PDB file of C-alpha atoms in Angstrom:
ATOM      1  CA  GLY A   1       0.064  -0.051   0.163  1.00 56.39           C
ATOM      2  CA  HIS A   2       2.346   2.685  -1.307  1.00 58.69           C
ATOM      3  CA  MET A   3       5.639   3.973  -0.262  1.00 55.43           C
ATOM      4  CA  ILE A   4       7.301   7.313   0.479  1.00 53.97           C
ATOM      5  CA  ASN A   5      10.617   8.647   0.312  1.00 50.24           C
ATOM      6  CA  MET A   6      12.886   5.885  -1.164  1.00 49.69           C
ATOM      7  CA  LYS A   7      16.039   6.467  -2.774  1.00 51.61           C
ATOM      8  CA  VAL A   8      17.808   3.763  -4.753  1.00 51.45           C
ATOM      9  CA  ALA A   9      21.200   3.654  -6.704  1.00 47.32           C
ATOM     10  CA  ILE A  10      20.708   1.144  -9.403  1.00 48.41           C
ATOM     11  CA  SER A  11      23.905   0.381 -11.861  1.00 49.14           C
ATOM     12  CA  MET A  12      23.459   1.221 -15.455  1.00 50.79           C
ATOM     13  CA  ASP A  13      25.865   0.707 -18.422  1.00 52.51           C
ATOM     14  CA  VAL A  14      24.110   3.003 -21.222  1.00 50.82           C
ATOM     15  CA  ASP A  15      20.462   1.813 -21.928  1.00 50.10           C
ATOM     16  CA  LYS A  16      20.188  -1.021 -19.322  1.00 48.71           C
ATOM     17  CA  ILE A  17      21.458  -2.990 -16.171  1.00 51.45           C
ATOM     18  CA  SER A  18      25.351  -3.029 -16.229  1.00 50.93           C
ATOM     19  CA  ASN A  19      27.141  -6.387 -15.463  1.00 51.95           C
ATOM     20  CA  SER A  20      28.124  -5.605 -11.820  1.00 50.11           C
ATOM     21  CA  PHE A  21      28.674  -2.434  -9.739  1.00 50.37           C
ATOM     22  CA  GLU A  22      32.336  -2.454 -10.066  1.00 48.86           C
ATOM     23  CA  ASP A  23      31.670  -2.183 -13.983  1.00 49.47           C
ATOM     24  CA  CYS A  24      28.647   0.211 -14.286  1.00 53.42           C
ATOM     25  CA  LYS A  25      29.127   3.381 -16.202  1.00 54.97           C
ATOM     26  CA  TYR A  26      26.841   5.577 -14.178  1.00 51.97           C
ATOM     27  CA  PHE A  27      24.107   5.275 -11.142  1.00 52.08           C
ATOM     28  CA  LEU A  28      20.499   5.824 -11.977  1.00 50.53           C
ATOM     29  CA  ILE A  29      19.281   7.585  -8.475  1.00 52.45           C
ATOM     30  CA  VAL A  30      15.645   6.532  -8.738  1.00 51.62           C
ATOM     31  CA  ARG A  31      13.314   8.797  -6.431  1.00 49.60           C
ATOM     32  CA  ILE A  32       9.941   7.104  -5.489  1.00 48.83           C
ATOM     33  CA  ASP A  33       7.117   9.228  -3.354  1.00 46.47           C
ATOM     34  CA  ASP A  34       3.866   7.540  -3.758  1.00 45.72           C
ATOM     35  CA  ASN A  35       4.884   3.701  -4.873  1.00 45.84           C
ATOM     36  CA  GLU A  36       5.847   5.224  -8.165  1.00 47.64           C
ATOM     37  CA  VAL A  37       8.877   7.321  -9.535  1.00 46.21           C
ATOM     38  CA  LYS A  38       8.500  10.981  -9.271  1.00 45.40           C
ATOM     39  CA  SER A  39      12.007  11.737 -10.550  1.00 46.69           C
ATOM     40  CA  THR A  40      15.502  10.537 -11.709  1.00 47.98           C
ATOM     41  CA  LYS A  41      19.209  11.633 -11.425  1.00 48.53           C
ATOM     42  CA  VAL A  42      22.514  10.402 -13.283  1.00 49.63           C
ATOM     43  CA  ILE A  43      25.997  10.078 -11.271  1.00 48.27           C
ATOM     44  CA  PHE A  44      28.670   8.764 -13.571  1.00 48.53           C
ATOM     45  CA  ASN A  45      30.819   6.220 -12.086  1.00 44.27           C
ATOM     46  CA  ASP A  46      34.076   7.703 -11.550  1.00 45.02           C
ATOM     47  CA  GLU A  47      35.182   8.194  -8.035  1.00 41.83           C
ATOM     48  CA  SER A  48      33.680  11.423  -7.339  1.00 45.56           C
ATOM     49  CA  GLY A  49      30.479   9.380  -8.557  1.00 45.26           C
ATOM     50  CA  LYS A  50      30.596   6.838  -5.424  1.00 48.49           C
ATOM     51  CA  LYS A  51      31.535   9.609  -2.963  1.00 49.84           C
ATOM     52  CA  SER A  52      28.241  11.417  -3.758  1.00 50.01           C
ATOM     53  CA  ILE A  53      26.273   7.924  -2.907  1.00 51.79           C
ATOM     54  CA  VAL A  54      27.556   8.095   0.551  1.00 49.81           C
ATOM     55  CA  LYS A  55      25.774  11.519   1.206  1.00 51.10           C
ATOM     56  CA  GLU A  56      22.389  10.691  -0.552  1.00 47.56           C
ATOM     57  CA  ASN A  57      21.680   8.655   2.317  1.00 51.03           C
ATOM     58  CA  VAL A  58      20.165   5.702  -0.207  1.00 53.92           C
ATOM     59  CA  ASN A  59      17.430   3.309   0.986  1.00 52.36           C
ATOM     60  CA  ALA A  60      18.966   0.381  -1.205  1.00 49.70           C
ATOM     61  CA  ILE A  61      21.249  -0.243  -4.102  1.00 50.33           C
ATOM     62  CA  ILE A  62      20.460  -2.912  -7.330  1.00 48.18           C
ATOM     63  CA  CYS A  63      23.084  -4.418  -8.951  1.00 51.86           C
ATOM     64  CA  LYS A  64      23.304  -7.858 -11.115  1.00 55.24           C
ATOM     65  CA  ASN A  65      26.826  -8.293  -8.884  1.00 57.24           C
ATOM     66  CA  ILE A  66      29.444  -6.552  -6.736  1.00 61.07           C
ATOM     67  CA  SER A  67      32.998  -6.939  -5.810  1.00 61.34           C
ATOM     68  CA  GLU A  68      33.595  -8.475  -2.225  1.00 60.85           C
ATOM     69  CA  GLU A  69      35.440  -5.510  -0.998  1.00 57.91           C
ATOM     70  CA  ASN A  70      32.600  -2.839  -2.127  1.00 60.00           C
ATOM     71  CA  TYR A  71      29.893  -4.840  -0.463  1.00 58.74           C
ATOM     72  CA  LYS A  72      31.631  -4.688   2.719  1.00 58.42           C
ATOM     73  CA  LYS A  73      31.861  -0.831   2.399  1.00 58.92           C
ATOM     74  CA  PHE A  74      28.364  -0.391   1.574  1.00 58.06           C
ATOM     75  CA  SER A  75      26.595  -2.801   3.224  1.00 59.78           C
ATOM     76  CA  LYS A  76      26.782  -1.159   6.505  1.00 59.14           C
ATOM     77  CA  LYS A  77      23.549   1.003   6.398  1.00 60.92           C
ATOM     78  CA  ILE A  78      22.255   0.271   2.672  1.00 59.62           C
ATOM     79  CA  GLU A  79      20.201  -3.040   1.561  1.00 61.13           C
ATOM     80  CA  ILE A  80      21.716  -4.412  -1.656  1.00 57.81           C
ATOM     81  CA  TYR A  81      19.336  -6.348  -3.771  1.00 57.66           C
ATOM     82  CA  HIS A  82      20.104  -8.576  -6.622  1.00 58.97           C
ATOM     83  CA  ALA A  83      18.549  -7.349 -10.007  1.00 60.51           C
ATOM     84  CA  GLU A  84      16.221 -10.136 -11.248  1.00 62.17           C
ATOM     85  CA  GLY A  85      16.336  -8.690 -15.324  1.00 58.85           C
ATOM     86  CA  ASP A  86      18.024  -6.231 -17.856  1.00 60.14           C
ATOM     87  CA  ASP A  87      14.634  -3.993 -17.846  1.00 59.75           C
ATOM     88  CA  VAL A  88      15.014  -1.740 -15.247  1.00 58.70           C
ATOM     89  CA  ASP A  89      11.376  -0.980 -15.327  1.00 62.03           C
ATOM     90  CA  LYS A  90      10.728  -4.515 -14.291  1.00 63.23           C
ATOM     91  CA  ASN A  91      13.317  -4.297 -11.600  1.00 61.83           C
ATOM     92  CA  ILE A  92      12.055  -0.818 -10.028  1.00 60.37           C
ATOM     93  CA  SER A  93       8.545  -2.552  -9.807  1.00 60.43           C
ATOM     94  CA  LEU A  94       9.800  -5.466  -7.905  1.00 62.16           C
ATOM     95  CA  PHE A  95      12.222  -3.302  -5.610  1.00 61.80           C
ATOM     96  CA  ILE A  96       8.895  -1.251  -4.741  1.00 60.68           C
ATOM     97  CA  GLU A  97       7.193  -4.464  -3.601  1.00 64.02           C
ATOM     98  CA  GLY A  98      10.419  -5.803  -2.131  1.00 65.96           C
ATOM     99  CA  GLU A  99      10.107  -9.121  -4.391  1.00 64.27           C
ATOM    100  CA  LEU A 100      13.724  -8.700  -5.431  1.00 63.13           C
ATOM    101  CA  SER A 101      16.090 -10.792  -3.206  1.00 62.70           C
ATOM    102  CA  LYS A 102      18.444  -8.626  -0.940  1.00 65.22           C
ATOM    103  CA  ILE A 103      21.944 -10.115  -1.623  1.00 66.40           C
ATOM    104  CA  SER A 104      23.548 -11.456   1.107  1.00 67.66           C
ATOM    105  CA  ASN A 105      25.589 -14.454  -0.279  1.00 65.46           C
ATOM    106  CA  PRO A 106      27.754 -12.223  -2.546  1.00 68.86           C
TER     107      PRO A 106
END
C-alpha cells in the first residue's frame, strides 16, 4: 500500500543494467514518493560518483553483481539487492514491492 521517500542507486551501463557494480558507467538515482517514480538522476561512475552515493543517504542498491570489497563497504546501512532482469522498469516495480532478493551471499 504505497511507499514514500525511497532512494535507490541502480547500476547502469548506457541503456540498461550493467554487469556488476564495479563495471557500471553511471548510477541512476531513482526517487519514489508514492509507490511511483517522481524523478531521476545520473551520477557517472568515476570516483567522485561513488562519494556522492554515501551522502545521498540511499535506501538500497540494485545490481547484477558486486565485488566482495565494495559489498563490505556499502552493506553497513544500505540494503543491497539483486537485479532480476535487464529491464530496469521490471526491476523498479519488483523493488517497490520488495520482491527482489536481498544479496546476503555475494
